[PDB]
């Protein structure tokens, strides 16, 4: 079995890369540990940058998104009994963000891939990577008990945080940067209309809360909870009572509640590895970096890693410029670090941290007061929120 | 002995308030623990905001400053082998800062006060404050062994961080916010021409360094040093060698060194008290708050506290609007907290902190890269550096 680019992981990253590659004539095979159904069960992302929206259009998978996606021109931040709106469009020079669930984006790509007839092996068990520095690397996996080998020119590790690709790079060649936060996000999906037409991020003494959405009749809410919490201790009723307690009274007042379609706790973490490649293996998305959800940058960074890898691979195949691939990491990391900085900043000003002294609490509040009340402060949030520009290459 | 406003402390705050008051016809007496010579020996500040410059003009003490002061339109920040200039004037909408030593400003005010014949008691020993909540407060002090009493209507505590005024407010009525940094600034004054026409703040792996000035032939340099250092362990030669090691090679190359006229270590600290008044006692300047020097806000915040107190006292005396004085703290604290936030931010991005993990070091570097490379980021630094606007009152 042979292909040009072997892709590990059928999440957004792998599917997007595969689609862009297939369309340009570069054969690729995707290997996924789970089933199509399992991948589709993951709720995750709701906010997309314009760069991601354009990439989906380039991959020709934007019909449903253009129809069903919601374009947002602003977002709200509530703190100390007041709501402040950040006009993203005005402050960023015209850019906006699009609310379209990750489940939907993944569904669209999966359908697009099937229609084109490109190769995808689900339930590819025990994927192993070999000869990463040779001229002929290969991947081995198990399908129903028999060990199969897939030869390729390059391997793109799009297998997420717990994937095999990052583990395959000799640990001594990698530099890891990580911060674990002492809290997580308890999320709840409901078939109820959102409380607002725009997102509301709330810093409240009891903890952080976020009112998001998926469509006109589907909402997604989150509340900060300590790491010791188990999802089974949070009944739907306990969640709604808690969410209401963390929102401004006039917002809590018009909130339509309902049974949860999904509930889960996601721990917050920052993680980056340098470099993002090794020989003929290139890491993309959650395989190379994790950002806390506060900034809505994760899936969006994966999109830029992919956009970059795809363009470099095109140059390598179409133009015989294989040496440009050595620049992958340097190009990606520039954008990754600025997005990590933004996600870290958002996280630190919106959440309540344990054992915080009086000085820090006051500085936290003043950070909000300053950035939300200054035209220059508002602009720094806005340009980062809509997403910083992608790098050209070369 | 009787007056209208008793002022404790003959540093910049007390002298400026006294001068503004005297000029408006409100009698005031200043009590100072030290001698004129001792006060004049303190080097301290070099950078003044435009608001402070205007206040000095209003007090009619700006002749020498207008002649000798240096107007700066920009400042430089060096980090990771690169120098980035922040165009203050362009980015702040036309404002600049003025470099005029605190020693000089204090000298100008002292001369101005003497010429007008206003009362100033130097070597006023053991100042005590009494009947702060009565309609008739009074101050007692010792002059050559005899205890004297000074009756007044109001008392302005302009006695700095170690003054008696803040100690006179029942501890239970005060809320203190404080952060002590694990390092100090070793400063050196020399009769040598500055290495640059504008200030250079440098974040270097060995520690922070700052190239400042007092005139065309007088320089002021600083290097971050741990709290365990004693000034006697730093010979002039050790200082120059260290400073040179922390600056970009092309800057170190043209640095003119020379014998120190003054050397001292100043520990870094953030401190604020709420409220800033009690009965007929009002705190101003370092008596109510300390900001680390990194942002050049200390003397500048004292100026705004004074501008505010003076205007409220005018209303009280001239207009019989004594009730407006209850607003002093609320007005001052708004500006104080934003300046504290700025000084804290500058301090955290420019200095090297002990036991810093890899993630934080990278975030520190990315903060600099972001704010120094974005038009909106540059504007947040600039508007804060030139000084945020004073509040109108009423
Ligand atoms: C609560 C939450 C909210 C978020 N909100 C947002 C948001 O609004 N906006 C945004 O930009 N980001 C957001 N994110 C982040 C975003 O969901 C992720 O960054 C994104 O899923 C990354 O996609 P990926 O394809 O890189 O990895 P994944 O989605 O993790 O997919 C990796 C795939 O690889 C497969 N795989 C793993 N191991 C193997 C193996 N050994 N062999 C083969 N296949 C394997 C996995 O099964 C998986 O299907 C959020 C995340 C969370 C958890
Ligand atoms: C290294 C350094 C650099 C700085 N750089 C700058 C800068 O460039 N720009 C800026 O804005 N700020 C800067 N500052 C801060 C600035 O110097 C101070 O904020 C400023 O001195 C405050 O003035 P003040 O009048 O409130 O207090 P002080 O200058 O401390 O004067 C208070 C006076 O009260 C007197 N006194 C004390 N106790 C008694 C008592 N019990 N009875 C009677 N009198 C008493 C003291 O003797 C003193 O004379 C810097 C400070 C340092 C240390």
What DSSP state is assigned to residue A391?
P
Q: Name the burial class of residue B148, with classes exposed (0-12), middle (13-18) and buried (19+) by CB atoms within 10 angstroms of its CB.
A: middle
Task: Identify which of B109, B125, B149, B153 has the alpha carbon closest to the alpha carbon of residue B18.
Answer: B109
Query: Any bridge partners for residue A272, and if so which?
Result: A177, A289
Q: Which two tokens stand for residue A54?
A: 């354009």
DSSP assignment string, A244-300? HHHS-HHHHTTPPP--EEEEEEEEEEEEEEE-SEETTEEE-GGGTEE--GGGS-HHH
Identify whether the C-beta of residue B28 lies closer than 8 Å to the C-beta of residue B3.
yes
CATH 3.50.50.60 domain range(s) in chain A: 1-72+96-180+269-351
Backbone angles phi, psi at A278, to 5 degrees: -160, 110
Strands (E), B56-124: 70-72, 74-79, 82-87, 97-99, 119-122
Ligand 2: residues with CB < 6 A are B 8-14, 31-34, 39, 44-47, 102, 124, 127, 158-160, 162-164, 185, 187, 266, 285-286, 293, 296-300, 302
CA B344/CA B178 separation, integer angstroms: 11
Judged by CB atoms closer than 8 Å, whether chains meet at A366 and B341 is answered as yes
What DSSP state is assigned to residue B25?
T
Å from A183 to nearest chain B CA? 18
CATH class for the domain made up of A1-72+96-180+269-351? alpha beta
As a whole number of Å, the CA-based R_g of chain B is: 21
CA B221/CA B268 separation, integer angstroms: 16
**Among residues A100, A138, A181, A201, which one is catalytic?**
A201
What DSSP state is assigned to residue A188?
E
Q: How many residues appear in chain B?
A: 394
Q: Which two tokens stand for residue B328?
A: 């002093």
Query: Any bridge partners for residue B201, and if so which?
Result: B77, B210
Judged by CB atoms closer than 8 Å, whether chains meet at B370 and A338 is answered as yes
Task: Identify which of A88, A38, A113, A126 has the alpha carbon closest to the alpha carbon of residue A296.
Answer: A88
Sign of CA dihedral A322, A324, A328, A332: negative
Residue A8 beta carbon below 6 angstroms from any ligand 1 atom: yes
Judged by CB atoms closer than 8 Å, whether chains meet at A338 and B376 is answered as no
Identify whether the C-beta of residue A143 lies closer than 8 Å to the C-beta of residue A125.
yes
CA B204/CA B83 separation, integer angstroms: 12
Name the residue with tokens 């035209």.
A375
* Ligand 1 atom with minimal separation from the A12 CA: 25
Identify whether the C-beta of residue B189 lies closer than 8 Å to the C-beta of residue B43.
yes
Contacts of B341 (CB under 8 A, 6+ apart): A363, A366, A367, A370
Query: What residues in B contact A340, CB-CB < 8 Å?
Result: 363, 366
Closest Cβ–Cβ partner in A272, A341, A360 for B370: A341
Closest Cβ–Cβ partner in A272, A359, A367 for B178: A359
Identify whether the C-beta of residue A186 lies closer than 8 Å to the C-beta of residue A231.
yes
Q: Which residues of B are catalytic?
A: 72, 201, 293, 297, 385
What DSSP state is assigned to residue B100?
-
Strands (E), B236-353: 260-274, 277-278, 281-283, 289-290
CA A84/CA B14 separation, integer angstroms: 40
**How many angstroms separate the Cα of B245 from the Cα of each of A169, A371, B249, B296?**
38, 36, 8, 24
Instruction: Count the Cβ atoms, other than its own, within 10 Å of residue B117.
Output: 8
Using DSSP, state whether B266 is helix, strand or coil: strand
Judged by CB atoms closer than 8 Å, whether chains meet at B176 and A272 is answered as no
CA B171/CA B185 separation, integer angstroms: 31
Judged by CB atoms closer than 8 Å, whether chains meet at A383 and B376 is answered as yes
Identify whether the C-beta of residue B362 lies closer than 8 Å to the C-beta of residue B26.
no
Task: Identify which of B293, B238, B302 has the alpha carbon closest to the alpha carbon of residue B266.
Answer: B293
CATH class for the domain made up of A73-95+181-268+352-388? alpha beta
CA A344/CA A346 separation, integer angstroms: 6
CA A306/CA A283 separation, integer angstroms: 9
Contacts of B54 (CB under 8 A, 6+ apart): none
A221 is catalytic: no
Identify whether the C-beta of residue A6 lies closer than 8 Å to the C-beta of residue A28.
yes
What DSSP state is assigned to residue B352?
P
Using DSSP, state whether B39 is helix, strand or coil: helix
CA A313/CA A308 separation, integer angstroms: 9
Helix or strand (DSSP H, E) at B390? none
What DSSP state is assigned to residue B359?
H
β-pairing verdict for A154-157 and A5-8 = parallel
As a whole number of Å, the CA-based R_g of chain A is: 21
Identify whether the C-beta of residue B47 lies closer than 8 Å to the C-beta of residue B339.
no
Residue A168 beta carbon below 6 angstroms from any ligand 1 atom: no
Identify whether the C-beta of residue A109 lies closer than 8 Å to the C-beta of residue A15.
yes
Identify whether the C-beta of residue B56 lies closer than 8 Å to the C-beta of residue B65.
yes
CA B97/CA B95 separation, integer angstroms: 7
CA B137/CA B281 separation, integer angstroms: 9
CA A17/CA A5 separation, integer angstroms: 10
DSSP assignment string, A318-379? HH--GGGGGGHHHHHHHHHHHHHHHHHHHHHHHSPPSS--HHHHHHHHHHHHHHHH-HHHHH
Cα–Cα–Cα angle for A147, A153, A156, rounded to 5 degrees = 80
What DSSP state is assigned to residue B175?
E
**How many angstroms separate the Cα of B208 from the Cα of each of B201, B237, B245, B347?**
8, 18, 11, 9
DSSP assignment string, A82-127? EEEEEEHHHHHTS--EEE--HHHHHHHHHHHHHHHT-EEEET-EEE
Peptide bond just before B143 cis, omega within 30 deg: no
CA A297/CA A53 separation, integer angstroms: 14
With the most atoms of ligand 2 within 8 angstroms of its CB, the residue from B44, B223, B281 to mutate is B44
Å from CA of A38 to ligand 1 middle:
12
What DSSP state is assigned to residue B135?
S
Query: Any bridge partners for residue A111, and if so which?
Result: none
Sheet holding B97-99, edge to edge: B47-48, B97-99, B70-72
CA B191/CA B189 separation, integer angstroms: 7
Using DSSP, state whether B336 is helix, strand or coil: helix
CA B327/CA B310 separation, integer angstroms: 13
**Among residues A138, A317, A328, A385, which one is catalytic?**
A385
CA B66/CA B7 separation, integer angstroms: 27
CATH 3.30.9.10 domain range(s) in chain A: 73-95+181-268+352-388
CA B79/CA B247 separation, integer angstroms: 9
Taking the C-alpha atoms of A297, A299, A300 and A304 in order, what is their torsion angle to the nearest 10 degrees?
Answer: 130
Q: Which two tokens stand for residue B341?
A: 């936030």
Q: Name the burial class of residue A205, with classes exposed (0-12), middle (13-18) and buried (19+) by CB atoms within 10 angstroms of its CB.
A: exposed
Query: What residues in A contact B366, CB-CB < 8 Å?
Result: 337-338, 340-341
HSE, side-chain direction, 13 A CA sphere, residue B164: 17
CA A175/CA A162 separation, integer angstroms: 17
Identify whether the C-beta of residue B95 lies closer than 8 Å to the C-beta of residue B88.
yes
CA A214/CA A208 separation, integer angstroms: 20
Cα–Cα–Cα angle for B292, B293, B297, rounded to 5 degrees = 95
Å from CA of B160 to ligand 2 middle:
6
CA B7/CA B2 separation, integer angstroms: 12
What DSSP state is assigned to residue A197?
S
Resolution (A): 2.0
List Cβ<8 Å contacts ≥24 apart for A51-58. A51/A300, A51/A303, A51/A304, A51/A307, A51/A387, A51/A389, A51/A390, A52/A98, A52/A299, A52/A300, A52/A303, A52/A387, A53/A98, A55/A16, A55/A20, A55/A303, A55/A306, A55/A307, A56/A16, A56/A105, A56/A108, A58/A20
Using DSSP, state whether B174 is helix, strand or coil: coil
Q: How many residues appear in chain A?
A: 394
DSSP assignment string, B184-240? EEEEEEESS--SSSS-EEEE-TT--EEEEEEETTEEEEEEEE-TT--GGG--HHHHH
CA B267/CA B308 separation, integer angstroms: 28
Sheet holding A154-157, edge to edge: A119-122, A28-32, A5-8, A154-157, A281-283, A277-278
CA B83/CA B303 separation, integer angstroms: 31
DSSP assignment string, A147-169? EEEEE-SEEEE---TT-STGGGS
User: How far from each other are the two terminal CA atoms of chain A, in whole angstroms?
Assistant: 34
Judged by CB atoms closer than 8 Å, whether chains meet at A376 and B374 is answered as no
Sign of CA dihedral A111, A115, A119, A121: positive
A267 is catalytic: no
CA A143/CA A164 separation, integer angstroms: 17
Identify whether the C-beta of residue A128 lies closer than 8 Å to the C-beta of residue A101.
no
Query: Any bridge partners for residue A146, and if so which?
Result: A143
Å from A173 to nearest chain B CA? 16
β-pairing verdict for B218-225 and B47-48 = unpaired
CA B20/CA A121 separation, integer angstroms: 82
Task: Identify which of B111, B99, B104 has the alpha carbon closest to the alpha carbon of residue B19.
Answer: B111
**How many angstroms separate the Cα of B337 from the Cα of each of A34, A384, B272?**
52, 25, 8
CA B132/CA A224 separation, integer angstroms: 46
CA B183/CA B268 separation, integer angstroms: 6
């Amino acid at each position: 079995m042979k292909t040009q680019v072997a892709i590990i992981g059928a999440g957004p990253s792998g599917l997007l890369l595969g689609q862009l590659l297939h369309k340009a004539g570069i054969d690729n095979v995707i290997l996924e540990r789970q089933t199509p159904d399992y991948v589709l069960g993951r709720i995750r992302a709701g906010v997309l940058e314009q760069g991601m929206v354009d990439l989906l259009r380039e991959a020709g998978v934007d019909r449903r998104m253009a129809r069903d996606g919601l374009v947002h021109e602003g977002v709200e931040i509530a703190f100390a009994g007041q709501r402040r709106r950040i006009d993203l469009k005005r402050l960023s020079g015209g850019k906006t963000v699009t609310v379209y669930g990750q489940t939907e984006v993944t569904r669209d790509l999966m359908e697009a891939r099937e229609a084109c007839g490109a190769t995808t092996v689900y339930q590819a068990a025990e994927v192993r990577l070999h000869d990463l520095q040779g001229e002929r690397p290969y991947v081995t996996f198990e399908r129903d008990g028999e060990r199969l080998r897939l030869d390729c020119d390059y391997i793109a590790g799009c297998d997420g945080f717990h994937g095999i690709s990052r583990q395959s790079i000799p640990a001594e060649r990698l530099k890891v940067f990580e911060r674990v936060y002492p809290f997580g996000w308890l999320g709840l999906l409901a078939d109820t209309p959102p409380v607002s037409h725009e997102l509301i991020y709330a810093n409240h003494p009891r903890g952080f809360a976020l009112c998001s959405q998926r469509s006109a009749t589907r909402s997604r809410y989150y509340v900060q909870v300590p790491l010791s919490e188990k999802v089974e201790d949070w009944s739907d009723e306990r969640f709604w009572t808690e969410l209401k307690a963390r929102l401004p009274s006039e917002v809590a007042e018009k909130l339509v509640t309902g049974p949860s379609l999904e509930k889960s706790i996601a721990p917050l973490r920052s993680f980056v590895v340098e470099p993002m490649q090794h020989g003929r293996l290139f890491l993309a998305g959650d395989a190379a970096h994790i950002v806390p959800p506060t900034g809505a940058k994760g899936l969006n960074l994966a999109a830029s890693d992919v956009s970059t890898l795809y363009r470099l691979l095109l140059k390598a195949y179409r133009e015989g410029r294989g040496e440009l691939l050595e620049r992958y990491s340097a190009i990606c990391l520039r954008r990754i670090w600025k997005a990590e900085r933004f996600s870290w900043w958002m996280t630190s000003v919106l959440h309540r941290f344990p054992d915080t002294d009086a000085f820090s609490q006051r500085i936290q509040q003043t950070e909000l007061e300053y950035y939300l009340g200054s035209e220059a402060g508002l602009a720094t949030i806005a340009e980062n929120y809509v997403g910083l520009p992608y790098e050209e290459i070369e």
